[PDB]
From a paper:
DDX20 (Gemin3) is a component of the SMN (Survival of Motor Neurons) complex that is involved in assembly and reconstruction of different RNP (ribonucleoprotein) complexes. DDX20, Gemin4 and eIF2C2 form a separate complex that contains numerous miRNAs. DDX20 also binds to the Epstein-Barr Virus Nuclear Proteins EBNA2 and EBNA3C. The poliovirus-encoded proteinase 2Apro cleaves DDX20 resulting in DDX20 inactivation and reduced snRNP assembly. The P-loop is in a wide-open conformation when ATP is bound, as seen in DDX20 as well as in the previously published structures of DDX19 and eIF4AIII. The AMPPNP-bound DDX20 structure contains no metal ion. Lack of γ-phosphate coordination by a metal ion leads to a shift in the position of the β- and γ-phosphates, which bind where the α- and β-phosphates are bound in other ATP complexes. Since the adenine base is coordinated in the usual fashion the α-phosphate and the sugar moiety are tilted out of the expected positions. This illustrates that DDX20 (and presumably other helicases) can bind ATP also in the absence of divalent cation. However, a divalent cation is needed to allow coordination of three phosphates in the correct geometry for catalysis.
DExD/H-box RNA helicases, from virus and bacteria to eukaryotes, play important roles in processes including ribosome biogenesis, RNA processing and folding, ribonucleoprotein (RNP) remodeling, RNA nuclear export, the regulation of RNA translation and transcription, and nonsense-mediated RNA decay. DExD/H-box proteins often contain accessory regulatory domains and localization modules, but their cores consist of two RecA-like domains joined by a short flexible linker. The N-terminal domain is commonly referred to as conserved domain-1, or DEAD-domain, and the C-terminal domain as conserved domain-2, or helicase domain. Both domains contribute to the binding site for RNA substrates and both contribute to ATP hydrolysis. We used X-ray crystallography to determine the structures of the DEAD-domains of DDX2A, DDX2B, DDX5, DDX10, DDX18, DDX20, DDX47, DDX52, and DDX53, as well as the helicase domains of DDX25 and DDX41.
Author numbering: 62 to 266
The structure:
Amino acid sequence: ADFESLLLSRPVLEGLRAAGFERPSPVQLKAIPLGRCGLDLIVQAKSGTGKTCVFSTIALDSLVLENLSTQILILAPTREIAVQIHSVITAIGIKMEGLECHVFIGGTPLSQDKTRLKKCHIAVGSPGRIKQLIELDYLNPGSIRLFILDEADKLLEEGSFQEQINWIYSSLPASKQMLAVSATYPEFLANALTKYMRDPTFVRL
Ligand SMILES: Nc1ncnc2c1ncn2[C@@H]1O[C@H](COP(=O)(O)OP(=O)(O)NP(=O)(O)O)[C@@H](O)[C@H]1O
């Protein structure tokens, strides 16, 4: 009923408290332990349920802070959502000295992203920019063990980023954990996630 019963690391517990997160929401209670367990998760719950906190907490708890390598990749369907994610992670991560979380979106020179990726624990970005950075080997995906799709319905809908995500998924290490979080779970999304998750655990309220 508090974040302690979820067995999170002390830095994450202290960060949550500092950032105003006093008690977990119903979806946070359910999803966080299962995330810590290393399972592939599909978290489907309506807006207002606390889903960004869910994957942000799982992500920060999983990080090897002393290893300055990109261990976590998070994709978002819009520039604004990518930054929203960065804000939550950097708030919850406030007691983790030297945490490096960076946003990769269009409009910044690729040379600048290359430099930033030299010191980056958690990469958050849009699928097109992330694919370009992996193709250039500016983001070497060799240490990524956690791959998160935020607003997965928006990412994988018709006219969106399925082709780019398929490519990125394939570039990553075979051994990794996947999280997909979404307000809805239509057939197109159920279908698309079969490419990435062999037997996912579902989390709903
Ligand atoms: N358990 C909680 N306790 C207090 N505040 C929370 C909690 N969960 C989320 N919040 C607040 O909401 C912000 C955004 O996180 P969150 O609610 O997880 O994402 P969101 O983008 O609103 N997605 P969702 O809530 O699922 O629609 C945080 O920065 C907090 O200010």
